[PDB]
Design a protein around this ligand. Structure first.
Ligand SMILES: [Mg+2]
Ligand SMILES: [Zn+2]
Ligand SMILES: [Zn+2]
Lengths: 1342, 99, 50, 90
DNA sequence: CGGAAGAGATTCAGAG
RNA sequence: UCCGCGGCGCG
DNA sequence: CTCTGAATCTCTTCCGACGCGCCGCGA
């Protein structure tokens, strides 16, 4: 229509709004009830808003279009269409101004901070409680002075008419119109440069920028106080009839009426010369009425109606989940849709869904009209309608003709991830249930216990082409969350295949030879041999040769009849070995995956369908079933339980003799019950799992049992070892609601009856779990909404940015366990640098190569330990990411195509598993390797051991090929029994430490001499009359005297002559201070060896909250402090609770001082040389400081590691890319440290793209570029921080962002996805992307 | 339940909700994100503008479908005009640019 | 008359329902026998003792 | 019927570009009424266009040159018509 | 309700 | 031809 | 002994899935 390019917002000038309005409304009247006609000058006055009916005058003067576009003479109504009623806005004119409640009440008082006034004063003047002052030079009274009534009278009775004092509305209007902007701008900036206080500086800066925003928008600030108030058109605030002729009035109409009434009252009291207090009361009521109209409930008590409910003001029509933004602009209701209960249909091919005939007829009724007239069977739409409503079977023939290639979309609420909507080619069935193919039903997360599903039909041919090419289920084989296929069988299919491939030691026809799988099928179907019988069969297989031909091979192999039968369906090219074992769920999954990699898409689809058919058929023929005799109870159980209860009695009587504390008695009982439960479980599994049967020759032999429940568990079709354990073994301990474990475990299994007590205590867990999931759903949905909002802008916009930067990928290893191999972390990513063959300079993998499966296998063969890959966070693309930095698209297998929206994919991929999350002294070598130290400094002693002065060293055990095997952190001062590079074996002790104390280490031998210490002041003389030998303890600051304050207890080391030995490498003396409350085992004046120690020192949350805190950039409550500077630590002044630490740079001239608290244990002893980003004290880690110290790569590695850790603990797989993209989206805001020659002001928040572009052009013309630091804002703030104010207003805090944009004079270019979705043009992603490129070229041409 | 076409609401001009009113299903925001995950722009545009809210575009679409031509002409969602009128009535001036 | 999937039973742990099924097969069993014992129209004393 | 389009996508490479090309081809086949280049077998214009691009007979540049030559034919008809009108006036 | 974040007001410590 | 509010109900 | 800045305390505001189905009531 109007083809707008952007949207602009600003304050409303009163002349502008008056120009909008086609008239003023002056009375609270709406419509007459004798005749349902609007009253003139009323809220629905037709003379203003136009006629109620098309071209119908209120007077009845004219009735048809012959006079279209003329006014009546008897009345001012116009001969036009009713649509104008929707458009035209009225206006009302107030006898007094009124503050617009938004600018007052918004969290920063924009008017208040503009005028520097406290909000209490502003409300006390605007609400008519006090006067305020405007000054004249003859009076000492200054302007903006608050003035109470007694002060008002006191001032006026001496200086009346010399100064002036007014109430809130008029005074604020006059003040705003009586101030200049440039003078206050310059005074504010001069104060900013002259002042120092950071609070004062930030207030000054925000005022400066507010004034700059007002001047650059040119919006006269006084406009913030309304003087003329718009009237919403009648249709948007409809008055709707009711039964009995009543009418429901929209609350907006009542608020408007009240405001009209108050305005009329105030004008009448003014024009008849009322006394002062009366008109003041009336105008205060009018101001309150306007506040109610705009934002009822925003201040004080909310207005309410007869229903005792608060009325919904205008602001409530846009705020909240019922608001206009969320309810209608997004999430429209749609035509051509249906819903129905779903149902299994196994006879369907993969790509076709069974759609009830009635729904098809209803949906395609327009298409049927069309084709029926086209084929000449019906002449007019009435004929078509009457024919289709009579269902003349020719309509059924036409209906079968129309849909033959017409895909439809199936959707299941909630649409957790994009698989939730899929496309199918319909097939017509009588009945009323929609029939799905079970395989895709598994992907839907759907079930068949009564889940409904909704169906939409695309209209246009471009739309149906999109549905076919993109959405058809034959395309969505690979999940976006990971590369593994999503179309995977379960339940009966897996059970059937498992039964079909399981062999037994002796069966009908064992040992015969079959010339081909067809004969195997014959012998099975003719009943002369059972599936399980082992036999030799001649089989042909094929392989993809070096050229790409399917070269054949034929041979005899040992197999089972069932296995040959299954092989017969396998397509050419897969090796026979894939089948020749007991096929579980995982085996079938990897079989489908290997089919998809070796062959194309369509052979895999056909293979899937054939698998489904054969599995179902043979499962049915199997007749597997569950019976009460199957859940065998191991007869050992009674004995084990008697033993356990005997031990319980023993420990209980041991406590009865008082030999132990009750807590340890509880612990012992719990331990023995757990041990007994495990023993019973093992006995049950052993008895169930295997059984003895006679062989062919007549002897007993063991084999895997065909017990039904065991077969179901072992196949992986359904159930688990836990459920089997509960079914037959004793189910064990259970927790009280506090999470503590009841001493008496539930002893009876499910097969025997549970007593009432066991059942009752068990119900605790059941209701805990149900409440748990009920609550978790909401948090998961909320989190997903957030992630989507933050990442929705990001789209692949170019092929290659040309960045050599990237991140280093190594396998994730914790505590000697390889939690994640390198192949998974690097598959599908592009090499940032050329990979070299280990130990050589030869290039193994070139730079900028997408690492597919063959490259990963090659990397594994050469045992490459680390790779460097391109990352989303390191991409140089502006307003997007390049295809090479993102890498392989999980859903397709190759490099991602241009124009794909990746952020939304990542957001859904993170959100969906969230439904599954839960929410309420020595080192031993594990295996062979070599010991290496990551970062260490070590000293060796007379005992032959090694003691370490690095506080964050890690042992790493390395493979003979240089790959890592194990790694473990080692505390300060631990003792080590081995040198670096020595060989190690499993179970070998290599290092030791006391975890219950902190030592202090002396590197060189010598004679200790106490220094800077006095007994009873810095140290006190412990003689442990109750414990043992003499000792000395440093007196804490509360215990030490003032003489012990500046004297810091220490010991120097001296030579044999008593001369103070120097540190071996520095000019500092070998001086070792004793921290507060430190303990030393040695007295003054004793010898100590090199590498020897003397010091004694006194020394979890749920997954979903943890991930929420990570992505919200939450500051941890005990932030570890790290060295902001490279230098030497140094002590200094002391004060209450906090120590004045200082770091002194080695070469730098700028020391820094920090208020390090003393209650946290310090890891610094006045000798620790330290570098930037090194830990000074431990604790939870603050992401912002990590970013400041160690850069973007450190923080991205930290975030990805934590999120992957929690998810892998749950067992869900999510590729790192979807976390890295979120991290890059978090990282937009930067701050300017110097402007160079740029126009940017210092300390401003700027989007990283803008400053990057500005610096690039600035250096492109040779000027000094600006410098910046990047700030990790939380995802909520980062989503609100965007320039696209429309998206922000859609998301949260609508009033705040609207006010901010309004005062700013913001403009949004409508470049993201959400904005275009609101507007309704094509999104700039996917197929729409191309449409935009031409447009932008035209916009470049324009 | 199934709805090809029927009644339309007064204020928002969107189709009615619920079986009793013979309304259509709701293409909730989660489904919109699902479409955004695909490159399927055209079906999204059709879902929002023509099928739902364009007071004239859906008439044109009905005409063309009856005629057997699967054209499309996206106008402007009337709910957007409703939002504009409410924001203006609030006293905040908002307007389109580059007409 | 009705065919149910067995796979649900171990994973939902509705073991009791299987027992119900068994009792059902027992219950109608007696019914069937007594039905036949009635259909042959034998002496009521025999069915009384049964 | 068409089980999958993946071969056509391989030919065009960009999946979305395939959708656009097939869309315009089907548009001109339906309203313009130009006949399919391959047998139709009671299929629909959509799958017809998909097969045609699958055979490599139809591609963005091929559409471009076809549109160019059709425009040249139309303008030749216009010029010959106006020359005939002038000959009628003379 | 509870938890988290922001803004304003009040109190304590350090420096003069 | 309709704005809801409250309530249960199934996903 | 006093003043300013920084830190701490108090008060106020915002947020805690999507989807359908019936019943009642309604200044
Ligand atoms: Mg279900
Ligand atoms: Zn008139
Ligand atoms: Zn890049």
């Amino acid at each position: 229509t109007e083809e707008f390019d952007a949207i602009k917002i600003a304050l409303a000038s009163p002349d502008m709004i008056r120009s909008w309005s086609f008239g003023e409304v002056k009375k609270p009247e709406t419509i007459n009830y004798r005749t349902f006609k609007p009253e003139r000058d009323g809220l629905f006055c037709a003379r203003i808003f136009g006629p109620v009916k098309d071209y119908e005058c209120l007077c009845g003067k004219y009735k048809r279009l012959k006079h279209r576009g003329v006014i009546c003479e008897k009345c001012g109504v116009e001969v036009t269409q009713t649509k104008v009623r929707r458009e035209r806005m009225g206006h009302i004119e107030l006898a007094s101004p009124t503050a617009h409640i938004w600018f007052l009440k918004s969290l920063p008082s924009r008017i208040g901070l503009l005028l520097d006034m406290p909000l209490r004063d502003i409300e006390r003047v605007l609400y008519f409680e006090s006067y305020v002052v405007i000054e004249g030079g003859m009076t000492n009274l200054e302007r903006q002075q608050i003035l109470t009534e007694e002060q008002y009278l006191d001032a006026l009775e001496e200086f009346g008419d010399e100064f002036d004092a007014k109430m809130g509305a008029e005074a604020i209007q006059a003040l705003l119109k009586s101030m200049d902007l440039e003078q206050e701008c310059e005074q504010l900036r001069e104060e900013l440069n002259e002042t120092n206080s950071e609070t004062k500086r930030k207030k000054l800066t925000k005022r400066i920028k507010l004034l700059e925003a007002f001047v650059q928008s040119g919006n006269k600030p006084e406009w913030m106080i309304l003087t003329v108030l718009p009237v919403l058109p009648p249709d948007l605030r409809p008055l709707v009839p009711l039964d009995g002729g009543r009418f429901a009035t929209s609350d907006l109409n009542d608020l408007y009426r009240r405001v009209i009434n108050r305005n009329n009252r105030l004008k009448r009291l003014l024009d008849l010369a009322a006394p002062d207090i009366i008109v003041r009361n009336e105008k205060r009521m009018l101001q309150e009425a306007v506040d109610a109209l705009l934002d009822n409930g925003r201040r004080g008590r909310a207005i309410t109606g007869s229903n005792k409910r608060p009325l919904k003001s205008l602001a409530d029509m846009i705020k909240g989940k019922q608001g206009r933004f969320r309810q209608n602009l997004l999430g429209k209701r749609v035509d051509y849709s249906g819903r129905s209960v779903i149902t299994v249909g196994p006879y369907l091919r993969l790509h076709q869904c069974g759609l009830p005939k009635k729904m098809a007829l209803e949906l395609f009724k327009p298409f049927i009209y069309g084709k029926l007239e086209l084929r000449g069977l019906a002449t007019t739409i009435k004929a078509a309608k009457k024919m289709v409503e009579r269902e003349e079977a020719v309509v059924w023939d036409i209906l079968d003709e129309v849909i033959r290639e017409h895909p439809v979309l199936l959707n299941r609420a909630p649409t957790l991830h994009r698989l939730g909507i899929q496309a199918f080619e319909p097939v017509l069935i009588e009945g009323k249930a929609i029939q799905l193919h079970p395989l895709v039903c598994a992907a839907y997360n759907a079930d068949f216990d009564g889940d409904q599903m909704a169906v939409h039909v695309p209209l246009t041919l471009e739309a149906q082409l999109e549905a076919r090419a993109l959405m058809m289920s034959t395309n969505n084989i690979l999940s976006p969350a990971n590369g593994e296929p999503i179309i995977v069988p379960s339940q009966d299919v897996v059970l059937g295949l498992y039964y079909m491939t399981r062999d037994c030691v002796n069966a009908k026809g064992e040992g015969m030879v079959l010339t081909g799988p067809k004969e195997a099928e014959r012998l099975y179907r003719s009943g002369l041999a059972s599936l399980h019988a082992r036999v030799k069969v001649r089989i042909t297989e094929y392989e993809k040769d070096a050229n790409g031909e399917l070269v054949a091979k034929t041979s005899l192999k040992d197999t089972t009849v069932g296995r040959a039968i299954l092989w017969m369906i396998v397509p050419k090219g897969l090796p026979y070995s894939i089948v020749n074992q007991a096929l579980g769920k995982k085996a079938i999954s990897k079989m489908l995956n290997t089919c998809y990699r070796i062959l194309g898409l369509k052979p895999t689809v056909i293979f899937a369908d054939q698998i489904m058919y054969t599995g179902f058929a043979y499962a049915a023929r199997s007749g597997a079933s569950v019976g009460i005799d199957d859940m065998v109870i191991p007869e050992k159980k009674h004995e084990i339980i008697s033993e356990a209860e005997a031990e319980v009695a023993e420990i209980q009587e041991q406590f009865q003799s008082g030999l132990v504390t009750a807590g340890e008695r509880y612990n012992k009982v719990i331990d023995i019950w757990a041990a007994a439960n495990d023993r019973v479980s093992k006995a049950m599994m052993d008895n169930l799992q295997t059984e003895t049967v006679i062989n062919r020759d007549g002897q007993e032999e063991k084999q895997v049992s065909f017990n039904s429940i065991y077969m179901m568990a072992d196949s992986g079709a359904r159930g688990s070892a836990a459920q089997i354990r509960q079914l037959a073994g004793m189910r064990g301990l259970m927790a009280k609601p506090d999470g503590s474990i009841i001493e008496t475990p539930i002893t009876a299994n499910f097969r025997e009856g549970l007593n009432v007590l066991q059942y009752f205590i068990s119900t605790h867990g059941a209701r805990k779990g149900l409440a748990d999931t009920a609550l978790k759903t909401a948090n998961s949905g909320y989190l997903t909404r957030r992630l989507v909002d933050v990442a929705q802008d990001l789209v692949v916009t170019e092929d290659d940015c040309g960045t050599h930067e990237g991140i280093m990928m190594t396998p994730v290893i914790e505590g000697g366990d390889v939690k994640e191999p390198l192949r998974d972390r690097v598959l599908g990513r592009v090499t940032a640098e050329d990979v070299l063959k280990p130990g050589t300079a030869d290039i193994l993998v070139p730079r900028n190569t997408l690492l597919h499966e063959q490259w990963c296998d090659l990397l594994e063969e050469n045992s490459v330990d680390a790779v460097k890959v391109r990352s989303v966070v390191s991409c140089d693309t502006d307003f997007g990411v390049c295809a090479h930095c993102y890498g392989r698209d999980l859903a397709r297998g190759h490099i991602i195509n241009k124009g794909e929206a990746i952020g939304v994919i990542a957001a859904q991929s993170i959100g969906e598993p969230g439904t599954q999350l839960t929410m309420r002294s020595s080192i031993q070598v594990k295996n062979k390797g070599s010991i290496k130290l990551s970062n260490v400094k070590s000293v060796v002693n007379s005992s032959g051991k090694l003691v370490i002065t690095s506080r964050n060293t890690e042992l790493k055990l390395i493979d003979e090929f240089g790959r890592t095997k194990e790694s473990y952190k080692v505390p300060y001062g631990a003792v080590l029994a081995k040198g670096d590079g020595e060989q190690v074996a499993g179970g070998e002790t290599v290092a030791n430490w006391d975890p219950h104390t902190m030592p202090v280490i002396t590197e060189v031998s010598g004679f200790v001499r106490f220094t800077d210490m006095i007994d009873g002041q810095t140290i006190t003389r412990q003689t442990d009359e109750l414990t043992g030998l003499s000792s000395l303890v440093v007196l804490d600051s509360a215990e030490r005297t003032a003489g012990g304050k500046d004297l810091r207890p220490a010991l120097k080391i001296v030579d044999a002559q008593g001369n103070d030995v120097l540190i071996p490498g520095t000019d500092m003396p070998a001086q070792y201070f004793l921290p507060g409350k430190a303990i030393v085992q040695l007295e003054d004046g004793v010898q100590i060896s090199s590498g020897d120690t003397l010091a004694r020192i006194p020394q979890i949350t749920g997954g979903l909250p943890r991930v929420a805190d990570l992505f919200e950039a939450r500051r941890p409550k005990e932030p570890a402090i790290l060295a902001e500077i490279s230098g030497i630590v140094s002590f200094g002044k002391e004060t209450k609770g906090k120590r004045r630490l200082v770091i002194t740079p080695v070469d730098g001239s700028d020391p820094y001082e920090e208020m390090i608290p003393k209650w946290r244990q310090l890891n610094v002893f006045e000798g620790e040389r330290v570098e930037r980003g090194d830990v000074i004290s431990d604790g939870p880690e603050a992401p912002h400081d990590i970013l400041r110290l160690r850069g973007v790569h450190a923080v991205t590695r930290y975030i990805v590691n934590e999120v992957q850790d929690v998810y892998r603990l749950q067992g869900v797989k999510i590729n790192d890319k979807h976390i890295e993209v979120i991290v890059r989206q978090m990282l937009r805001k930067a701050t300017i440290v110097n402007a160079g020659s740029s126009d940017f002001l210092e300390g401003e928040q700027v989007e990283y793209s803008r400053v990057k572009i500005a610096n690039r052009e600035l250096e492109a013309n040779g000027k000094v570029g600006a410098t910046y630091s990047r700030d990790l804002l939380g995802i909520t703030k980062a989503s609100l921080a965007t320039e696209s104010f429309i998206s922000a207003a859609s998301f949260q805090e609508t009033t705040r962002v609207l006010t901010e944009a309004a005062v700013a004079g913001k403009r949004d270019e409508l470049r993201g996805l959400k904005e275009n979705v609101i507007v309704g043009r094509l999104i700039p992603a996917g197929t729409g992307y191309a449409y935009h490129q031409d447009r932008m070229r035209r916009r470049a041409a324009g | 339940h199934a709805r090809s076409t029927g009644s339309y609401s007064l204020v928002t001009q969107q189709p009615l909700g619920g079986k009793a009113q013979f309304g259509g299903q709701r293409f909730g925001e989660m489904e919109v994100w699902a479409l955004e995950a695909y490159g399927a722009a055209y079906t999204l545009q059709e879902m929002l503008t023509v099928k739902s809210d364009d007071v004239n575009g859906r008439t044109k679409m009905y005409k063309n479908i009856v005629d057997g031509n699967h054209q499309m002409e996206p106008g402007m969602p009337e709910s957007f005009n409703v939002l504009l009128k409410e924001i203006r009535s609030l006293g905040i001036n908002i307007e389109l640019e580059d007409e | 008359d009705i065919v149910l999937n067995p796979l649900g039973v171990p994973s939902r742990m509705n073991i009791g329902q299987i027992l119900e099924t068994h009792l059902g097969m027992a219950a109608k069993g007696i019914g069937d026998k007594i039905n036949a014992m009635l259909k042959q129209q034998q002496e009521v004393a025999k069915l009384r003792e049964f | 019927a068409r089980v999958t389009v993946q071969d056509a996508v391989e030919k065009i490479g960009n999946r979305f570009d395939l959708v656009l090309v097939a869309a315009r081809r089907a548009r001109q086949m339906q309203v313009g009424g130009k006949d399919p280049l391959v047998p139709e077998e009671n299929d629909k214009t959509t799958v017809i266009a998909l097969r045609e691009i699958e055979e490599g007979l139809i591609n963005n540049q091929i559409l471009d040159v076809r549109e160019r030559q059709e425009q040249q034919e139309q303008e030749a008809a216009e010029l010959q018509a106006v020359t005939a009108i002038a000959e009628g006036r003379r």
